[PDB]
Write a protein that binds this DNA or RNA. Structure first.
Lengths: 137, 138, 172, 197, 52, 190
RNA sequence: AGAACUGGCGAUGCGGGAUGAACCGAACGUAGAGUUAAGGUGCCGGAAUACACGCUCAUCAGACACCACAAAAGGUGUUAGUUCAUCUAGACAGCCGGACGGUGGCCAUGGAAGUCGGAAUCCGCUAAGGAGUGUGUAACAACUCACCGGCCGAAUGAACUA
RNA sequence: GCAGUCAAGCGUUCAUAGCGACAUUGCUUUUUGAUUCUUCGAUGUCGGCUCUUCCUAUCAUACCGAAGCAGAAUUCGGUAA
């Protein structure tokens, strides 16, 4: 065609109001939101929902999300958790299959011996079914 | 010396803005110095014309906001290559001497200013039959 | 020369029958303990007045903290230091939330770049910057630009194990 | 965790790869490495050529027979660095270099089994961009390696066979995805799901 | 036989250069510093000398 | 100072079709098409329209900024070349020995050939690139011109020729013999 | 080579600097555990491919005092800084518009009208204009500057320092 | 002994093609020196012969650059053992 086809990779961008996971430290596995940028490697986050304070942090232990919301720069914690829940964002991270596997390995860790035998036999029967099913198919 | 020169230009602009009751902001885009001098030679009657850096023009008027407060809305129209044709002579006649005579199309009248009022020059170029349609239809 | 803090050290000459209650003198100090704070206080006051610690006394030490410490902020910084061949003044600027970590990075940068060390280094002054566009340093004004935002390309994924059976990525 | 591991040097860096491998062989983890020709190194080709030439000219003045064997192959180059990392004079070093093998390309059995990767050696991630690099195959052929082409030939052949296999397996898996989702929408599936699997 | 224009042209491409006072290199006749490593990107240059 | 991010704008006008993917840049226009491979750089392309593209660096150093700018110039040259064509004219020059220039093929190799170079019994040969064209002018003497979209091919072969036409052992300032480019413009636009 | 203080080798092992009488550490009954020294933790090698702020790419990189070196002097590689100036009354970069009249200024001659040259560097009106910085015509014609204004709008340059 | 910096000045002019005053910073151990550690219950103590190898601060040969290179010849110089 006459249509020029550019392909730019799509990266999770640092920006105001950006929803973020903390992966290390005391607030490991939590969520916060970036408000303002300090530098390339430093930012300000806040997790009043998740219980993470308002603090400066490092992008190496921080890991970004594909999610984001909108926000006025300089906002304080009231407005923070406000627009957060207004956006209803924990719900969306819950919808994130990422987080589904998070809680998956969580539960899988929290399993019990007898639960594992249960899983064993359940998967056995399921397997027989799927075996003969796909054998037909 | 350069600041004295810019202030000298400001002195001309103030002298003119105060002494003359009207000024025609004229778009001077692509006007040649020879066309300008012919405009001067024809405007020797009344009108005097002043050019310069529009930034200095706007700085001049912004400084002159203390008295003569109503030059403030000249500044949205101090843009592009424009200059002032200050005068006391009648509107349509100065407008015709500016636009028609010694033009090449090409100096235009970007804006005209008279006694704290704003004219797009269209109502000025309105020749006749407007008062007729107004008085007859009413 | 470790995690930093800040203290106000105040001291005076030892009183006398001639001068009971001599003048007190203050300094804001950055240091990792009141000990060093007092130390460098004696240092600066030695290089200013004709006093030694056994000539004076510390009225007080007061550990200081920031007003609004969840506020990312700019500072201008005036520093003196000592090169191999001489000594020089300097003015730098910082973007950080606290004077403490600001000075932290200040020193670590004067180590990496100029290899002037804490002993070689003297703070003249620190001041948080009120106004934007009064920053003079572009590596800061970059970050000052409005509605700023960016990526962090080439993600690196820390391995806790040796082998990964799959070619990793940086899709981030 | 296995009696074997299998590594490619693709995108890897030599020193760090050899580091981990030597530590692991000493701790008793049996290895092979292959596709050695696809190793990579820091710096540009000329510097690396210079360093190889240093090692090259440094030999036993009075008999190049018994002096330091200069090997030409990417394989043996990595091997040499590994030996420099290992105490090859011990019975321990002897047994470890017995445990170890390395090749270039990737022969039949060792292709039909799996390949892995070691992030602690990887060009792509460990290098910082803007910075140059190098490849062992070119270095080897520069400094006298002969067989660089037979390699690529066989590797194209094998990659063809493997991509074919891969797509076969993919289509099979998509079928299996279908005939498994069919029962994924089932009670026992729900049971296992709330069980966490 | 050969005209002034072609003369000045080939002169541009050959005659109008500058030289490193150390490595004797073929440098642009208006350049500032050397382009070569060993001369250290020094700034010690000359105009090339013209004939007769 | 580790500049945060920058970019530059590239004009993709009417008649042009550019496909970019993974630093592999193909472009098409009237004269044909041109491809280029910039996998030696880590910098991103972006489309805003078939008239406008940008390319951006993120968290960059000075060298990489310079790389971005020169890459703009690269692709713009590609565009201009597959659109207007590129045209490089060299005049032969000699004081005594006329530079006998011809063309020959060997297996269809299309080597330019030159003789009589300052009395040289030497026979000089220069291969011709693909996609390029050569012409002996008539309105003016010894006004050999070459052309093509590939500015690389054009300029480099032109210089190849004027380099093989290089006098040894003697003072060039008098012994000016050899070829020299006179002018460069576009095939199109005259 | 020779003297002063002290401490050390010799008489003295051990840990480490690969290696070593003199360094640093610390001094020994024979064993057990523990904590450490100086020193170090990619592998050889026991120990974090630990974290973190950054400097650096070397066609001769660098990498631990003592200890097996390297200097002056230079670099528009690179980093950071100082001081001075230009510039928001609009800079510079860079574009764009005018780039004239008295006037083709005088001599030079087939023709020379700002640009082959010899000799003068004025005046006007200007935001401004060189009696012209060059391109082009046989010569006008046509362009871009000097000089000034439209534009972006905040930056640009000089000298320095380590 | 070797190599450099600065630049008075030569080079008809021309600081720096080639050179370079007054100063000055290093390098090598093929010079002599200085020392006396090793060896005086044993190191065979000039020279040349024949013989292999190494070095480079390159004389020639290859290739290039610069010049006060018109050609020729020549010099300055780099890669180069």
């Amino acid at each position: 065609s006459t249509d020029s086809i550019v392909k730019a990779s799509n990266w999770r961008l640092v920006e105001v109001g950006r929803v973020v996971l903390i992966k290390k430290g005391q607030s490991a596995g939590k969520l916060a939101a970036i408000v303002e940028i300090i530098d390339q490697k430093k930012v300000l986050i806040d997790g009043p929902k998740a219980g993470v304070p308002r603090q400066a942090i490092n992008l190496g232990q921080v890991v970004l999300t594909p999610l984001t919301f909108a926000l006025p720069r300089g906002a304080r914690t009231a407005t923070v958790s406000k627009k957060w829940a207004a956006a209803a964002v924990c719900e969306k991270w819950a919808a994130s299959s990422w987080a589904k596997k998070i809680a998956q390995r969580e539960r899988r860790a929290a399993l019990t011996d007898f639960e594992r035998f249960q899983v064993m036999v359940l998967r056995k029967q399921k397997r027989y079914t799927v075996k003969k099913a796909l054998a037909k198919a | 010396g350069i600041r004295e020169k810019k202030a000298e230009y400001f002195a001309k602009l103030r002298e003119y803005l105060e002494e003359y009751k009207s000024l025609f902001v004229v778009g001077v885009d692509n006007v040649s110095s020879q066309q300008m001098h012919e405009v001067r030679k024809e405007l020797r009657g009344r009108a005097v014309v002043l050019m310069g850096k529009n930034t200095m023009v706007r700085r001049a008027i912004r400084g002159f906001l203390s008295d003569l407060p109503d030059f403030e809305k000249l500044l949205p129209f101090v843009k592009g290559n424009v200059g002032f044709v200050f005068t006391n002579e009648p509107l349509t006649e100065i407008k015709n001497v500016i636009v028609s005579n010694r033009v090449a199309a090409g100096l235009t009248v970007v804006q005209v200013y008279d006694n704290g009022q704003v004219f797009p020059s269209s109502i000025l170029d309105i020749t006749d039959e407007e008062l007729v349609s107004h008085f007859v239809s009413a | 020369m470790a995690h930093f803090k800040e203290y106000q050290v105040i001291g005076r000459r030892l009183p006398t029958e001639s001068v009971p209650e001599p003048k007190l003198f203050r300094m804001r100090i950055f240091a990792s303990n009141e000990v060093i704070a007092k130390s460098r206080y004696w240092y600066f006051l030695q290089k200013l007045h004709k006093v030694k610690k056994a000539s004076g006394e510390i009225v007080s030490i007061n550990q200081i903290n920031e007003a609004h410490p969840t506020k990312v902020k700019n500072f201008g910084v005036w520093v003196r230091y000592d090169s191999r061949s001489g000594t020089h003044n300097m003015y730098k600027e910082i973007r950080d939330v606290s004077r403490v970590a600001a000075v932290e990075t200040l020193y670590q940068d004067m180590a990496a770049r100029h290899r002037a060390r804490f002993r070689s280094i003297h703070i003249l002054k620190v001041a948080e910057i009120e106004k934007t566009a009064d920053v003079k340093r572009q590596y800061v004004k970059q970050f000052l630009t409005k509605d700023l935002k960016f990526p962090l390309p080439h993600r690196v994924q820390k391995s806790t194990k040796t082998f990964s059976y799959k070619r990793p990525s940086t899709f981030y | 965790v296995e009696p074997v591991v299998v590594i490619d040097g693709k995108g890897h860096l030599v020193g760090r790869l050899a580091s981990v491998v030597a530590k692991q062989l000493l701790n008793g983890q049996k290895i092979v490495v292959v596709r050695a020709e696809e190793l990579n190194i820091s710096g540009e080709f000329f510097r690396n050529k210079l360093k190889y030439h240093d090692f090259l000219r440094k030999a036993t003045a009075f008999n190049k027979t018994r002096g330091p064997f200069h090997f030409r192959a990417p394989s043996r180059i990595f091997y040499k660095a590994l030996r420099g990392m290992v105490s090859h004079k011990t019975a321990r070093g002897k047994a470890a270099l017995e445990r170890l093998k390395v090749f270039e390309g990737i022969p039949p059995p060792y292709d039909k089994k799996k390949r892995v990767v070691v992030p602690q050696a990887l060009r792509v991630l460990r290098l910082k961009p803007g910075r140059k690099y190098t490849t062992l195959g070119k270095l080897s052929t520069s400094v006298g390696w002969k067989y660089e082409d037979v390699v690529a030939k066989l590797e194209a052949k094998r990659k063809v066979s493997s991509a074919e296999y891969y797509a076969k397996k993919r289509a099979f898996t998509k079928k299996v995805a279908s005939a498994n989702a069919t029962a994924a929408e089932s009670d026992v599936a729900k049971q296992l799901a709330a069980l966490g699997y | 036989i050969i005209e002034p224009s072609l003369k000045a042209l080939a002169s541009k491409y050959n005659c109008d250069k500058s030289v490193c006072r150390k490595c004797y290199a073929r440098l642009p006749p208006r350049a500032t510093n050397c382009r070569k490593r060993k001369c250290g990107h020094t700034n010690q240059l000359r105009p090339k000398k013209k004939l007769k | 100072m580790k500049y945060i991010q920058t970019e530059q704008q590239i004009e993709v006008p009417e008649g042009v079709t550019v496909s970019i993917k993974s630093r592999i840049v193909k472009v098409v226009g009237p004269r044909g098409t041109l491809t280029k491979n910039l996998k030696h750089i880590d910098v991103t392309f972006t489309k805003v329209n078939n008239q406008l593209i940008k390319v951006a660096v993120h968290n960059g150093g000075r060298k990489h900024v310079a790389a971005l700018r020169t890459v703009k110039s690269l692709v713009d040259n590609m565009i201009t070349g597959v659109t207007k064509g590129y045209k490089y004219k060299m005049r032969y020059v000699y004081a005594h020995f006329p530079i006998n220039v011809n063309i020959v093929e060997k297996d269809g190799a299309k080597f330019i050939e030159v003789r009589n170079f300052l009395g040289d019994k030497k026979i000089r040969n220069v291969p011709v690139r693909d996609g390029v064209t050569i012409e002996f002018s008539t309105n003016v003497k010894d006004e050999i011109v070459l052309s093509g979209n590939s500015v690389e091919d054009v300029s480099q072969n032109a210089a190849d020729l004027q380099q093989i036409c290089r006098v040894r052992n003697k003072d060039i300032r008098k012994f000016l013999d050899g070829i020299y480019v006179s002018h460069k413009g576009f095939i199109t636009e005259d």
